[PDB]
Paper text:
Here, we report the first structure of glycerol kinase from the thermophilic filamentous fungus [name] (CtGK). Glycerol kinase (EC 2.7.1.30) catalyzes the transfer of phosphate moiety from ATP to glycerol to form glycerol 3-phosphate (G3P). Overall, the CtGK polypeptide chain can be divided into two distinct domains classified by Pfam as FGGY_N (residues 65–325) and FGGY_C (residues 331–583) connected by a flexible region. A similar case is found in CtGK, which forms extended dimers via the interaction between the C-terminal domains with a prominent contribution from hydrophobic residues (Phe422, Gly436, Phe389, Leu394, Thr437, Phe439, Gly440, Ile441, Thr437, Thr445, Leu438, Ile450, Trp580).
We initially determined CtGK in an apo form using ethylene glycol as a cryoprotective agent. Initial molecular replacement efforts using a conventional approach were unsuccessful, we, therefore, decided to solve the structure using a MoRDa automated structure refined pipeline. The asymmetric unit (ASU) contained two polypeptide chains. The electron density map allowed for building the residue ranges 65 (or 67 for chain B) to 583. A short loop of 8 (or 9) amino acids (542–548/9) connecting the α-helix H18 and a β-strand S18 could not be modeled due to insufficient electron density. This likely reflects the high flexibility of this loop. The physiological dimer is not contained in the ASU but completed by a symmetry-related chain forming a rather elongated assembly (A:B’ and B:A’). The dimer interaction is mostly mediated by β-strands located on the C-terminal domains. Although crystals were grown from the same condition, the collected datasets were processed in different space groups. We observed that in the absence of nucleotide, CtGK adopts open conformation, which upon nucleotide binding closes up.
Author numbering:
A (entry chain A): 67 to 541, 550 to 583
B (entry chain B): 65 to 541, 549 to 583
Write the structure that this text describes.
């Protein structure tokens, strides 16, 4: 009845859902990347554009294998990797260069000079973001500045910029060769560029004046809401041709919607090499005083007000496990690392400050390295494994507490997906440390369900939010509850904060 | 023939060895015996399990001695070296113990010590006896026994109580105990310098010291302090395989190790490795009270008209314990050989530093609130970095103690001899020479501690005439034996610099 496009960094895919949130079709084909110098990442635009409509042609032929068709489906939404900068010609509808994916770090030079300018300190309170290498403001500028090929398209009047969501929507309505050429972005992606006032949801002339981008010389994408039938046009050519595009959400905002994290204080944590945390702060935007990112969680328009969020990341969660295995020869497999941590009753007094490349929000300690405290002849691999897992939960709490202070709303729930969210012990400890229930849903493609939720509300599939989350019932092991005395959990977190402070100042030059 | 026998009564084992004139042993026997741990921190021994193990070693050893065609006629005399500070109480008329021995690492005196410190005349003890109040000295053990054992308190009151370090106990019995012509209740200056009952410059007892502990020299028979090399004060073995063989040497074990290395010049030091380290530093005829927490004791009292020699002492709690930790606790490798190999497998510590303060840090740092702390871990850290850091920790703590020794004494470090345990790791000691900037001497003759007692005995009986005759004879003798510095002083000083930073960043971890 509804469906979803989930294009990202490694791959595309196209799932199609029902009124209960159950995915009844999928098709996913990968694609590879370049590293043409340390810190450089690129991607020919058409590759993933073609990648995605390759997915829909197979995904939707399987779809009809049980007698369903487009006429049975109302609209489709889009969720996409963020911060990726694309550039093309007003005239052609064709790339005037290749793309700069978010991992790229060629802008470091540019960022360090931008950070010097006097009015660089006024940006954060307006776009909600720190000057960095990920934002699209600097990827685009670097090209206007450095690139030999298409500085003139800026100068001549024929250049158009877009995030991935816009490029897809562009050609999927018929490129420049269509009745109504659709060149737009949703709020959750434009919050990433550093061109948008977070309070206005509209391009700010002060932020463009900082980077020197003249709107008369460049064609930017019209910012629209994440749920709208008219504004995303329709699908140009394919099995879904003529079906309305009605959804668009950035990568990690869409996941929150799929988990139905619609209330202030609701957070989610995605584990991996590290963590990525997202915190729903409500209808009023919040600028972090702790180095966290402020973004748009979702903008369903339709009369309702936009909901914002705070963003936080941790460099080391799963890397801590790999370290104990490959670097220390504890075990040759991650499961056995949990077994070594369920080995022992407690951390034995051990604390592992996993600051391999320093520490980040909320601490911001650049002169620390990995530091292991509390070792005795009684310490064993179990204790160190247990502490390594605890390091992840302490840094999670530290950020969540920071978003509590930033936002003025206390934490109410946390949902978690990712390799180390599989550790029952790790997830139980988070509930003990955070004093709040830790949710772990079986459903996997949350990040694509959000784009479909948005398209559905635009089209009457779901009446409201309170309705979206009643429909999902259709689709220890799912929820972990605080079992430790609140006093013992404060004691653990205090030894950890103590260890962090005593880690400061290791690297002297 | 003419050989010299040596009883080495240790805290875990007893052994009896028989040395020729050039310090090489030809007969040996060793016995691990029972150590009792009745509760947390307490450590006891049956005083007869120590005598018995010694006697068994004498039987076993000279069985081997005879197989070579020798006998007692070929043994001029016998030397004794023992675990220090281990306390024994016995009835001065029956000769039978009144309580198990309390071995030196016992902790039961923590309350007695913490209170004695309060008594406010304690700051004077260090300059008289060379030691501060610890759980280790015999005084507080003897006191705990009295304050908590009616059996000894009675014998005390009745005037029939005798205390003695293990050396006194042994010589008392091997001469026949009571019930003998020429009974012997004597201790050597080295062992007597560990009780806190004796004045270090005097080499005699101090009434003010025993006034501090509530001990009167009439109600208790103290062993007679005698030279470590006396032809007649130690008497002779009465029965057994060595009946009639004179005893002429007696030295605390750590002093005997220094003598076995021929460390008689001021500035010569030695390090005995084990679970931890014991370092001794020769400082000449004048005793030197430490300002860095080191212990001042007697190095050796060889008589024959030569002034006693004193020493400074330090100890590290974690040297071999660190290797054991990496192998068993972290599964790195199952033998010290492979830990070394893993340490040589990489070029350097990779920026890793391991403050091996499992039970806090002792001299000269005196940090009680630190625990084992490992710095410098990145995703590029491998087991050889940590292995390297673990061996380096022992060397840094060694250099720390030796630099305190130089400052206290005024003598530049002239040499360092090494025996036991981690001594066998060429990279550990190569690194030690690198860090301290002096050559490191490792002899291949392993029973260095047993040798020092035989030296004392032989000097009292003419096996060696003077002390330059002794090191001449030893040299009458695979692995290397000398490690020379290889490192840029700058890099060596950077490594020690990072260590001292890590030590300082490690304090304050433990809170109560």
């Amino acid at each position: 009845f509804v469906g979803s496009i989930d294009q990202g960094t490694t791959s595309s895919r196209f799932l199609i859902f029902n009124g209960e949130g159950n995915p009844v079709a999928s098709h996913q084909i990968e694609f590879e990347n370049l590293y043409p110098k340390s810190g450089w990442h690129e991607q020919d635009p058409y590759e993933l554009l073609n990648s995605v409509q390759q997915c829909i042609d197979g995904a939707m032929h399987k779809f009809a294998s049980l007698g369903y068709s487009k006429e049975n489906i109302r609209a489709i939404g889009i969720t996409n990797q963020r911060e990726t900068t694309v550039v093309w010609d007003s005239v052609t509808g064709e790339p005037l260069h290749n793309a700069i994916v978010w991992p790229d770090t060629r802008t470091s030079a540019l960022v360090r000079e931008l950070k010097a300018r006097q009015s660089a300190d006024s940006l954060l309170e307006l776009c909600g973001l720190p000057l960095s290498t990920y934002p699209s403001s600097v990827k685009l500028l670097w090209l206007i500045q450095n690139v030999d090929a298409v500085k003139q398209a800026y100068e001549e009047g024929r250049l158009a910029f877009g995030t991935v969501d816009s490029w897809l929507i562009y050609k999927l309505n018929g490129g420049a060769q269509a009745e109504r050429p659709i060149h737009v972005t949703d709020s959750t992606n434009a919050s990433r560029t550093m061109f948008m006032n977070l309070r206005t949801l509209q391009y700010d002339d002060k932020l463009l004046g900082f980077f020197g981008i003249d709107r008369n010389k460049i064609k930017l994408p019209k910012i629209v809401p994440s749920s709208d039938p008219e504004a995303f046009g329709k699908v140009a050519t394919g099995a879904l041709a003529g079906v309305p595009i009605a959804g668009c959400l950035g990568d990690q905002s869409s996941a929150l919607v799929g988990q139905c994290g619609f209330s202030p204080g609701q957070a989610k944590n995605t584990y991996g090499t590290g963590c990525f945390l997202l915190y729903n702060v409500g209808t009023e935007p919040v600028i972090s005083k702790y180095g966290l990112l402020a973004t748009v969680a979702y903008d369903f328009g339709r009369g309702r007000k936009p909901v914002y969020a705070l963003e936080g990341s941790i460099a080391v969660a799963g890397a801590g496990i790999t370290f104990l295995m490959n670097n220390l020869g504890f075990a040759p497999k991650p499961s056995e690392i949990n077994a070594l941590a369920e080995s022992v009753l407690d951390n034995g007094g051990v604390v592992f400050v996993t600051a391999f490349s320093g520490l980040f929000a909320p601490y911001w300690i650049d002169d620390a390295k990995g530091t292991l405290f509390g070792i005795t002849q009684h310490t064993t691999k179990g204790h160190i494994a247990r502490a390594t897992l605890e390091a992840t939960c302490y840094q999670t709490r530290a950020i969540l507490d920071a978003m509590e202070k930033d936002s003025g709303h206390k934490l109410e729930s946390l949902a978690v997906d990712g390799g180390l969210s599989a550790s029952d012990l790790c997830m139980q400890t988070q509930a003990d440390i955070s004093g709040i229930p830790v949710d772990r849903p079986r459903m996997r493609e949350t990040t694509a369900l959000g784009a479909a939720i948005a398209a559905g509300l635009a089209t009457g599939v779901w009446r409201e939010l309170d309705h979206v989350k009643e429909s999902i019932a259709g689709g220890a092991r799912e929820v972990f509850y605080p079992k430790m005395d609140r006093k013992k959990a404060e004691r653990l977190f205090r030894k950890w904060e103590q260890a962090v402070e005593m880690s400061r100042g290791w690297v002297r030059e």
